[model samples]
Target: RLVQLSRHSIAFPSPEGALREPNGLLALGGDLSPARLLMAYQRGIFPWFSPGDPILWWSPDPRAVLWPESLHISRSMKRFHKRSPYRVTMNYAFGQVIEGCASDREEGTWITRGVVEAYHRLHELGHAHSIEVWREDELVGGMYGVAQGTLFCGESMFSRMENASKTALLVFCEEFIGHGGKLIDCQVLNDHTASLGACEIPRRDYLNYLNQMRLGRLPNNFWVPRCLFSP
Candidate 1:
């Protein structure tokens, strides 16, 4: 059954009802409140809609994920990484990283202002995090996500230079795995993610992983602001 959402509720329709026509558009209409967003992400539902469109929730079957341990950094990337000119850091500059992700795209954007402010609240509460890439004084690449339990629900990423975004993810995977993060829910796969070894797993499998650590915690200090590396 197609679902229409309402404001302030933490509930959402089951993933089984998500449309099969293409993207798993599960529901429409909802406020981007922090509780609802946290619930949606923890339950594997995500909000994605064009700015002019009504708010939409998605629960894609055959969900895409990046097992941090499975990331296969290429020799070419490794070679470039050896002398990389960027510095990577976590949980710093999340506000700006998210803003950068929304710009530099055709038609201007897809992430809504509502989404931004909502996640900002989540960040303030420590439920959202960012991995940023910088070239000395300038931010060159970054990604942001909602972290619920052990899964990092990556919302989006952007780059101002070649391989900048890739460098962010690469370093993020290394640091994430090192820090006890178990899975990265990229939500959907694209060329960049695919090349990083992102693959689709059944939605039920994802649900099981979610249940495995629905209230899990990493070391309290894992998200502390720090440099990952200056590659």
Candidate 2:
């Protein structure tokens, strides 16, 4: 059964009760308050409803996860980076990064205007973070998500130039692992993510990951606005 949600509390039904038919449709109807967002991530649940639809929570059966230490960078990409001309920064251009991620989608984006507003506020509170990729000082690609302890629940990413978004992910993995990040909850798998080295673990395994790592801490300076890579 899909659990109904209320803004009165940030509580949620366990992910095990989530409907398998929709592949982890766990709940509906909650607002995206920061408290709710944080709590949801801590429990391995994330929202994915379309615009004008009631908010839907999901925790898929085969969760796609990327371990920070194991991010794969293709030989072509590694060579591309040797003389790379891009600069990547953390929390430096979030408004542009988030909007850039939404504007380039061909299909209707899940990141509606309301969703951006909610996450922007989440950014201000320091729970949400973004990685911005730049070329010629213009934003070309980026990613944004909520951080739950040592885990980051990647919400969305966009690329304007070929391989720019890939660069963002590559650089971020190094930075995240250096700062104690353990895992990235990609939520579901697709070819793009799969190509980038994300692999599936059973949902039960993912929930166990959350239980152990969600409260783990990192350095205080880890998330502050700063450049992570430039080459």
Q: List model 2 lDDT by residue over 1-231, tens digit each.
A: 567998788899989998888899999998888888878888889888877799999889989999887777889999998788789999998888889877777522888898888889999999899999999768889999888888888888899887889999999998888878899989898888888889999999999988888878889889899998877
Model 2 is weakest, by summed lDDT over 10 consecutive residues, at 101-110
What lDDT score is found at residue 187 in candidate 2? 88
lDDT for model 2 comes to 0.87
Among these predicted structures, which one has the highest TM-score?
Answer: 2
lDDT of 1 by residue, 1-231 (tens): 788887746788888889986668899887888888888887789888888898888988888999998887889888989999999999889999989987867522876687788889999998899999999899998998888777788888889987898899989887777767899897888787898899999988988888776677788888888899965
Per-model TM-score versus the true fold: 0.94, 0.96
**Residue pairs of candidate 1 with colliding backbone atoms:** 84-231
